[PDB]
Design an enzyme around this catalytic site. Structure first.
Site: not given
Ligand SMILES: C[C@@H](O)[C@H](NC(=O)c1ccc(C#CC#Cc2ccccc2)cc1)C(=O)NO
Ligand SMILES: [Zn+2]
Length: 300
Positions: A79, A242, A265, A238
Protein backbone atom coordinates in the site's frame (compact mmCIF):
# COMPACT_ATOMS: atom_id res chain seq x y z
CA UNK A 1 11.35 20.40 -19.30
CA UNK A 2 12.78 16.88 -18.74
CA UNK A 3 10.92 14.34 -16.62
CA UNK A 4 13.08 14.32 -13.48
CA UNK A 5 13.48 11.87 -10.63
CA UNK A 6 11.60 12.80 -7.47
CA UNK A 7 12.11 12.41 -3.75
CA UNK A 8 10.50 14.00 -0.66
CA UNK A 9 11.03 17.68 0.16
CA UNK A 10 10.90 17.04 3.94
CA UNK A 11 10.97 14.18 6.43
CA UNK A 12 7.50 13.08 7.53
CA UNK A 13 6.48 10.75 10.34
CA UNK A 14 3.47 8.53 11.04
CA UNK A 15 2.30 6.03 13.66
CA UNK A 16 0.14 2.96 13.20
CA UNK A 17 -0.21 -0.80 13.67
CA UNK A 18 0.79 -3.72 11.44
CA UNK A 19 -2.32 -5.44 9.95
CA UNK A 20 -0.94 -8.94 10.59
CA UNK A 21 1.41 -8.49 13.58
CA UNK A 22 -0.81 -6.03 15.49
CA UNK A 23 2.42 -4.30 16.64
CA UNK A 24 2.66 -0.54 17.07
CA UNK A 25 5.07 0.90 14.48
CA UNK A 26 6.66 4.29 13.81
CA UNK A 27 7.10 5.14 10.11
CA UNK A 28 9.54 7.77 8.78
CA UNK A 29 9.75 8.82 5.12
CA UNK A 30 13.04 10.59 4.29
CA UNK A 31 14.53 12.20 1.16
CA UNK A 32 17.09 10.10 -0.72
CA UNK A 33 19.71 10.78 -3.45
CA UNK A 34 19.33 10.09 -7.19
CA UNK A 35 19.11 6.37 -8.23
CA UNK A 36 18.64 5.13 -4.61
CA UNK A 37 15.16 3.72 -5.37
CA UNK A 38 12.75 3.03 -2.48
CA UNK A 39 14.81 1.59 0.41
CA UNK A 40 13.17 0.13 3.54
CA UNK A 41 15.19 0.46 6.78
CA UNK A 42 14.70 -1.44 10.08
CA UNK A 43 15.86 1.28 12.55
CA UNK A 44 14.93 -0.88 15.61
CA UNK A 45 17.84 -3.26 14.79
CA UNK A 46 21.55 -2.64 15.61
CA UNK A 47 23.16 -2.34 13.04
CA UNK A 48 20.39 -0.80 10.93
CA UNK A 49 19.40 -3.20 8.12
CA UNK A 50 18.49 -1.62 4.75
CA UNK A 51 16.35 -3.51 2.18
CA UNK A 52 15.88 -2.05 -1.34
CA UNK A 53 12.24 -2.36 -2.54
CA UNK A 54 13.15 -4.60 -5.49
CA UNK A 55 11.70 -7.87 -6.91
CA UNK A 56 14.95 -9.71 -5.95
CA UNK A 57 14.31 -9.05 -2.20
CA UNK A 58 10.69 -10.34 -2.11
CA UNK A 59 10.24 -13.07 0.50
CA UNK A 60 6.90 -14.63 1.55
CA UNK A 61 3.93 -13.55 -0.69
CA UNK A 62 1.02 -15.34 1.02
CA UNK A 63 -1.02 -12.57 2.73
CA UNK A 64 1.03 -9.49 1.85
CA UNK A 65 4.25 -8.59 0.04
CA UNK A 66 7.30 -9.02 2.29
CA UNK A 67 10.81 -7.74 1.63
CA UNK A 68 13.65 -9.86 3.06
CA UNK A 69 17.43 -9.54 3.50
CA UNK A 70 18.93 -12.48 5.36
CA UNK A 71 16.45 -13.24 8.17
CA UNK A 72 15.38 -9.54 8.61
CA UNK A 73 11.90 -8.82 7.21
CA UNK A 74 9.70 -5.86 6.30
CA UNK A 75 6.02 -6.99 5.91
CA UNK A 76 3.08 -5.48 3.93
CA UNK A 77 4.91 -2.92 1.77
CA UNK A 78 2.36 -2.85 -1.14
CA UNK A 79 0.00 0.00 0.00
CA UNK A 80 2.95 2.34 0.73
CA UNK A 81 4.70 1.35 -2.53
CA UNK A 82 1.39 1.95 -4.34
CA UNK A 83 1.30 5.55 -2.95
CA UNK A 84 4.95 6.15 -4.01
CA UNK A 85 4.25 4.84 -7.57
CA UNK A 86 1.05 6.91 -7.80
CA UNK A 87 2.90 10.16 -6.89
CA UNK A 88 6.04 9.38 -8.94
CA UNK A 89 8.45 9.03 -6.01
CA UNK A 90 11.67 7.53 -7.38
CA UNK A 91 13.89 7.84 -4.32
CA UNK A 92 13.13 7.61 -0.59
CA UNK A 93 14.25 6.02 2.65
CA UNK A 94 11.41 4.31 4.52
CA UNK A 95 12.38 3.84 8.19
CA UNK A 96 10.40 1.43 10.41
CA UNK A 97 10.61 0.77 14.17
CA UNK A 98 9.10 -2.76 13.57
CA UNK A 99 8.88 -5.54 10.94
CA UNK A 100 5.52 -4.37 9.46
CA UNK A 101 4.42 -1.19 7.63
CA UNK A 102 1.42 0.42 9.46
CA UNK A 103 -1.96 -0.46 7.85
CA UNK A 104 -3.40 3.09 8.55
CA UNK A 105 -7.05 3.00 7.21
CA UNK A 106 -6.35 -0.03 4.91
CA UNK A 107 -5.81 2.06 1.77
CA UNK A 108 -3.11 4.35 0.26
CA UNK A 109 -5.01 7.58 1.16
CA UNK A 110 -3.12 8.43 4.38
CA UNK A 111 0.30 7.81 2.72
CA UNK A 112 -0.59 9.83 -0.39
CA UNK A 113 -1.73 12.69 1.92
CA UNK A 114 1.42 12.45 4.15
CA UNK A 115 3.74 12.44 1.10
CA UNK A 116 1.94 15.44 -0.50
CA UNK A 117 1.83 17.30 2.88
CA UNK A 118 5.67 17.10 3.06
CA UNK A 119 5.95 17.99 -0.63
CA UNK A 120 7.96 16.54 -3.52
CA UNK A 121 11.41 17.58 -4.78
CA UNK A 122 12.44 17.17 -8.43
CA UNK A 123 16.09 15.96 -8.56
CA UNK A 124 18.82 16.70 -11.17
CA UNK A 125 18.70 13.36 -13.00
CA UNK A 126 16.30 12.04 -15.64
CA UNK A 127 13.44 9.77 -14.54
CA UNK A 128 13.99 6.24 -15.87
CA UNK A 129 10.97 4.26 -17.12
CA UNK A 130 10.67 0.53 -17.93
CA UNK A 131 8.85 0.29 -21.28
CA UNK A 132 7.10 -3.00 -22.15
CA UNK A 133 8.17 -4.02 -25.71
CA UNK A 134 6.66 -7.55 -25.83
CA UNK A 135 3.88 -9.37 -24.01
CA UNK A 136 4.83 -11.35 -20.88
CA UNK A 137 2.32 -13.59 -19.06
CA UNK A 138 2.35 -15.94 -16.06
CA UNK A 139 -0.36 -18.42 -15.07
CA UNK A 140 -1.07 -20.70 -12.12
CA UNK A 141 -4.33 -22.65 -12.20
CA UNK A 142 -7.11 -20.22 -13.20
CA UNK A 143 -5.03 -17.13 -12.06
CA UNK A 144 -3.34 -14.88 -14.67
CA UNK A 145 -1.13 -11.73 -14.68
CA UNK A 146 -0.07 -10.14 -18.04
CA UNK A 147 2.09 -7.22 -19.27
CA UNK A 148 1.01 -5.73 -22.63
CA UNK A 149 2.85 -3.00 -24.64
CA UNK A 150 0.85 0.25 -24.21
CA UNK A 151 1.76 3.92 -24.74
CA UNK A 152 0.95 5.05 -21.19
CA UNK A 153 0.18 3.30 -17.94
CA UNK A 154 -3.01 1.20 -17.59
CA UNK A 155 -4.13 -1.39 -15.02
CA UNK A 156 -7.01 -3.80 -15.62
CA UNK A 157 -8.21 -6.24 -12.99
CA UNK A 158 -10.98 -8.81 -12.55
CA UNK A 159 -11.97 -10.67 -9.32
CA UNK A 160 -14.13 -13.80 -9.17
CA UNK A 161 -16.05 -14.33 -5.91
CA UNK A 162 -19.18 -16.51 -5.91
CA UNK A 163 -20.82 -14.33 -3.25
CA UNK A 164 -23.96 -12.08 -3.00
CA UNK A 165 -22.04 -8.74 -2.59
CA UNK A 166 -19.66 -9.55 -5.57
CA UNK A 167 -21.89 -9.44 -8.69
CA UNK A 168 -22.41 -7.29 -11.80
CA UNK A 169 -19.87 -4.95 -13.49
CA UNK A 170 -18.21 -4.10 -10.09
CA UNK A 171 -16.08 -7.36 -10.35
CA UNK A 172 -13.95 -5.84 -13.22
CA UNK A 173 -12.30 -2.42 -13.61
CA UNK A 174 -9.83 -0.69 -15.95
CA UNK A 175 -7.91 2.46 -14.96
CA UNK A 176 -6.02 4.42 -17.68
CA UNK A 177 -3.82 6.87 -15.69
CA UNK A 178 -3.55 9.44 -18.59
CA UNK A 179 -7.29 10.26 -18.14
CA UNK A 180 -7.84 8.99 -14.53
CA UNK A 181 -6.34 10.16 -11.20
CA UNK A 182 -4.66 7.58 -8.90
CA UNK A 183 -5.39 9.81 -5.87
CA UNK A 184 -9.10 10.33 -6.55
CA UNK A 185 -10.14 6.98 -8.08
CA UNK A 186 -7.75 4.35 -6.58
CA UNK A 187 -5.78 5.59 -3.48
CA UNK A 188 -8.75 5.44 -1.02
CA UNK A 189 -9.66 1.78 -1.86
CA UNK A 190 -9.34 -0.21 1.39
CA UNK A 191 -8.14 -3.75 1.96
CA UNK A 192 -10.76 -6.40 2.54
CA UNK A 193 -11.33 -9.89 3.85
CA UNK A 194 -14.10 -12.45 4.32
CA UNK A 195 -14.98 -13.18 7.97
CA UNK A 196 -14.27 -16.98 7.75
CA UNK A 197 -10.78 -16.26 6.28
CA UNK A 198 -10.14 -13.53 8.93
CA UNK A 199 -11.16 -15.98 11.68
CA UNK A 200 -8.73 -18.57 10.21
CA UNK A 201 -5.86 -16.01 10.05
CA UNK A 202 -6.53 -14.82 13.66
CA UNK A 203 -6.37 -18.51 14.78
CA UNK A 204 -2.83 -18.67 13.19
CA UNK A 205 -1.80 -15.38 14.95
CA UNK A 206 -2.23 -13.32 11.73
CA UNK A 207 -4.60 -10.39 10.93
CA UNK A 208 -4.03 -9.29 14.62
CA UNK A 209 -4.14 -5.54 13.88
CA UNK A 210 -7.23 -5.96 11.65
CA UNK A 211 -10.48 -4.09 12.44
CA UNK A 212 -13.43 -2.26 10.84
CA UNK A 213 -11.31 0.99 11.06
CA UNK A 214 -8.59 -0.42 8.68
CA UNK A 215 -10.40 -3.14 6.61
CA UNK A 216 -13.69 -3.91 4.85
CA UNK A 217 -15.10 -7.01 6.53
CA UNK A 218 -17.58 -9.13 4.57
CA UNK A 219 -19.54 -12.03 6.15
CA UNK A 220 -21.58 -14.63 4.12
CA UNK A 221 -24.11 -11.96 2.86
CA UNK A 222 -23.02 -8.35 3.67
CA UNK A 223 -20.36 -5.73 4.45
CA UNK A 224 -20.19 -5.52 8.28
CA UNK A 225 -18.67 -1.96 8.20
CA UNK A 226 -21.39 0.45 9.48
CA UNK A 227 -20.28 3.38 7.25
CA UNK A 228 -20.22 1.37 3.98
CA UNK A 229 -17.97 1.65 0.92
CA UNK A 230 -15.94 4.55 -0.53
CA UNK A 231 -16.41 3.28 -4.09
CA UNK A 232 -19.12 1.15 -5.65
CA UNK A 233 -16.26 -1.13 -6.90
CA UNK A 234 -13.92 -0.64 -3.90
CA UNK A 235 -12.78 -4.31 -3.81
CA UNK A 236 -11.45 -4.53 -7.41
CA UNK A 237 -9.98 -0.95 -6.97
CA UNK A 238 -8.03 -2.26 -3.93
CA UNK A 239 -6.70 -5.13 -6.09
CA UNK A 240 -5.65 -2.50 -8.67
CA UNK A 241 -3.97 -0.57 -5.78
CA UNK A 242 -2.17 -3.79 -4.70
CA UNK A 243 -0.95 -4.43 -8.28
CA UNK A 244 0.48 -0.87 -8.65
CA UNK A 245 2.41 -1.38 -5.39
CA UNK A 246 3.70 -4.84 -6.33
CA UNK A 247 4.65 -3.61 -9.86
CA UNK A 248 6.72 -0.81 -8.28
CA UNK A 249 9.12 -3.51 -7.02
CA UNK A 250 10.56 -3.28 -10.60
CA UNK A 251 12.42 -0.16 -9.30
CA UNK A 252 11.05 2.21 -11.99
CA UNK A 253 7.70 3.42 -13.35
CA UNK A 254 6.15 1.29 -16.10
CA UNK A 255 5.16 2.31 -19.63
CA UNK A 256 2.71 -0.45 -20.36
CA UNK A 257 -0.42 -2.25 -19.41
CA UNK A 258 -1.09 -4.77 -16.63
CA UNK A 259 -4.03 -7.17 -16.74
CA UNK A 260 -4.74 -9.33 -13.71
CA UNK A 261 -7.29 -12.15 -13.38
CA UNK A 262 -7.63 -13.34 -9.75
CA UNK A 263 -3.95 -12.34 -9.42
CA UNK A 264 -2.34 -11.85 -6.03
CA UNK A 265 0.96 -10.84 -4.47
CA UNK A 266 2.58 -14.23 -5.39
CA UNK A 267 1.60 -14.28 -9.09
CA UNK A 268 2.38 -10.49 -9.39
CA UNK A 269 5.95 -11.13 -8.17
CA UNK A 270 6.22 -14.13 -10.57
CA UNK A 271 5.18 -11.78 -13.43
CA UNK A 272 7.94 -9.31 -12.39
CA UNK A 273 10.60 -12.04 -12.21
CA UNK A 274 9.66 -13.35 -15.72
CA UNK A 275 9.68 -9.79 -17.18
CA UNK A 276 13.10 -9.01 -15.61
CA UNK A 277 14.46 -12.31 -16.96
CA UNK A 278 13.03 -11.77 -20.50
CA UNK A 279 15.23 -8.73 -21.38
CA UNK A 280 13.87 -8.63 -25.02
CA UNK A 281 10.41 -7.76 -23.56
CA UNK A 282 11.52 -4.39 -22.08
CA UNK A 283 13.91 -1.40 -22.20
CA UNK A 284 14.87 1.60 -20.09
CA UNK A 285 13.77 5.01 -21.49
CA UNK A 286 14.00 8.65 -20.31
CA UNK A 287 12.25 11.86 -21.49
CA UNK A 288 14.37 14.99 -21.99
CA UNK A 289 11.18 16.65 -23.37
CA UNK A 290 8.03 15.99 -21.25
CA UNK A 291 5.80 16.82 -24.30
CA UNK A 292 6.92 13.53 -26.01
CA UNK A 293 6.21 11.38 -22.86
CA UNK A 294 2.99 9.29 -22.56
CA UNK A 295 2.86 9.47 -18.70
CA UNK A 296 2.37 12.73 -16.74
CA UNK A 297 2.88 13.57 -13.06
CA UNK A 298 1.47 16.22 -10.75
CA UNK A 299 3.51 19.34 -9.86
CA UNK A 300 6.10 18.65 -7.10
C1 LIG B 1 -5.64 -9.22 -1.35
C2 LIG B 1 -6.23 -8.43 -0.17
O1 LIG B 1 -7.40 -9.02 0.30
C3 LIG B 1 -5.20 -8.39 1.03
N1 LIG B 1 -5.78 -8.28 2.38
C4 LIG B 1 -5.76 -9.24 3.41
O2 LIG B 1 -5.11 -10.28 3.23
C5 LIG B 1 -6.50 -8.98 4.69
C6 LIG B 1 -6.34 -9.86 5.77
C7 LIG B 1 -7.01 -9.62 6.98
C8 LIG B 1 -7.85 -8.49 7.11
C9 LIG B 1 -8.56 -8.33 8.31
C10 LIG B 1 -9.26 -8.07 9.23
C11 LIG B 1 -10.03 -7.87 10.33
C12 LIG B 1 -10.77 -7.84 11.26
C13 LIG B 1 -11.66 -7.84 12.35
C14 LIG B 1 -12.80 -7.00 12.32
C15 LIG B 1 -13.77 -7.09 13.34
C16 LIG B 1 -13.60 -8.01 14.39
C17 LIG B 1 -12.45 -8.84 14.43
C18 LIG B 1 -11.47 -8.75 13.41
C19 LIG B 1 -8.01 -7.59 6.03
C20 LIG B 1 -7.34 -7.84 4.82
C21 LIG B 1 -4.39 -7.13 0.84
O3 LIG B 1 -4.86 -5.99 0.82
N2 LIG B 1 -2.99 -7.34 0.67
O4 LIG B 1 -2.40 -6.30 0.06
ZN1 LIG C 1 -3.86 -4.56 -0.24
Amino acid sequence: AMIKQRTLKNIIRATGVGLHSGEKVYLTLKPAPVDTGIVFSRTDLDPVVEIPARAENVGETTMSTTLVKGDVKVDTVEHLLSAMAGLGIDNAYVELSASEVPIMDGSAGPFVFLIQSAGLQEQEAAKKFIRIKREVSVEEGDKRAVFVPFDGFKVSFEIDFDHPVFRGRTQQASVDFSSTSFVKEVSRARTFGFMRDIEYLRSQNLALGGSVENAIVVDENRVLNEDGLRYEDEFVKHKILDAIGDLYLLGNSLIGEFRGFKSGHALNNQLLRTLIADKDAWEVVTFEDARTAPISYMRP
